[PDB]
């Protein structure tokens, strides 16, 4: 997967496992959510293309959101969209599969950097807009969480298990966006 | 309500109604959510003390969260807790009741400032910790959203209406935290 450097950034994030413990406590993420986000694994594995169709559909239907993938001339950069799509697809699996350990935190830092002007457009060597305004990362917690529910509900598991998977996904999405604020936030205010 | 200055800050926020329109689109908030957040009004009105008992209970049971209300000596500042509680109670009603217009945006800016070192501890003239790290504001979207659901479900309205009220509350909480990032975020990155 071009540009995907999980576990090999060779850069230790400015947050550690103690920070993560406290952040998990604030978002109410426990061992129960680890169990159920992992069960979401097998459920979502075969559906990732349809999930990305939904998410890219949402972005593409809103000029002010599609903006973030545009070339200077205002048209969508198709190379950029396609390359990011492969990494975004993989993130769905990583969220369900990966242990949230230091390697995971180091990639969280990287993902935040890539939305921020610090590293945006470098991974794919594209010319596009310099920064994704942080307000929209937070806003996206809702669509990224809520649009996942129909996909969780399809694989013939109990509605009770689906609800637990869904709450785990909401917490995990929130947790990650909180971490991605680091490069946006004034030093010492994070 | 001491310190509550909604509609009388006399300061125009750095975001306007066009910004709000675009942010509402990103969080999927529509006229349907306005209808249902308003219906949450009558439902939550009589329950606000119990809601705050729940939220203050959550904060109080976690030393690293209760930290934000502590005096320098590490003990909770009871005056601070009580004064904030009255404004936090009112915010529940404002979220359901108020039109999200420019006055509302101007108070959103104010609330963000009060969590941030810019204005924290000034409203109540207390000595406490200088800043609430932004990571925790995002994290709190989960507990503030999820713990509201049992209160929405109690007033004998249909489960279908409860679900619509709940989704509206999730979107509104997310929307607000997105706005409150403004004083935390490096200038031009919001
Ligand atoms: C909950 C919020 C969001 C999630 C979960 C999310 C997820 C992701 C992921 C997983 C990647 C690929 C990371 C990698 O390189 O491995 C990515 C990249 C990207 N996302 Fe987001 N994203 C969010 C918010 C946004 C928003 C609001 C936009 C605006 C359209 C956006 C546009 C982009 C763009 C343009 C890239 C490529 C950045 C680069 O140049 O490297 N994302 N996102
Ligand atoms: C979804 C996230 C949050 C919501 C909805 C929320 C809501 C509120 C509201 C409505 C107020 C009163 C605003 C006013 O002055 O009118 C307030 C103040 C305050 N909140 Fe939050 N809050 C959030 C996150 C946090 C977190 C994570 C903490 C950490 C314990 C916290 C601690 C405080 C403190 C210490 C104040 C007083 C700030 C000051 O000195 O003026 N809040 N909050």
In short:
Helix content of chain A is 60%, strand content 0%. Chain A contains ten helices and no strands. The complex binds protoporphyrin IX containing FE (2 copies).
What is the element layout, followed by pairings?
The structure is a homodimer of 190-residue chains.
Chain A (H helix, E strand, L loop, with lengths): L16 H11 L3 H14 L3 H13 L2 H4 L11 H20 L4 H14 L18 H6 L1 H6 L2 H4 L6 H22 L10
Helix pairs in contact in A: 2-5, 2-10, 3-5, 6-10
The structure holds protoporphyrin IX containing FE (2 copies).
The site of one protoporphyrin IX containing FE has 24 residues of chain A, from helix 5, helix 6, helix 7, helix 8 and helix 10.
PDB class: transport protein
Keywords: hemoprotein structure, protein matrix tunnels, protoglobin, methanogenesis, archaea protein, transport protein
Assembly: dimeric
The amount of beta strand of chain A, in percent, is: under 5%
* Radius of gyration of chain A, whole Å: 16 Å
Quaternary organization: homodimer
Helix content of chain A: 55-70%
Bound molecules: protoporphyrin IX containing FE
Mind telling me the CATH superfamily name of chain A? Globins
Number of spatially distinct domains of chain A: 1
The first-to-last residue Cα distance of chain A is: 31 Å
Main β-sheet description of chain A: none
At the fold tier of CATH, the topology name of chain A is Globin-like
Topology pattern of chain A, helix = H, strand = E: HHHHHHHHHH
Outline of chain A: globular
Determine the number of helices of chain A (DSSP H or I, runs of at least 4 residues): 10
PDB class: transport protein
Keywords: hemoprotein structure, protein matrix tunnels, protoglobin, methanogenesis, archaea protein, transport protein
Assembly: dimeric
Entry title: High resolution structure of protoglobin from Methanosarcina acetivorans C2A
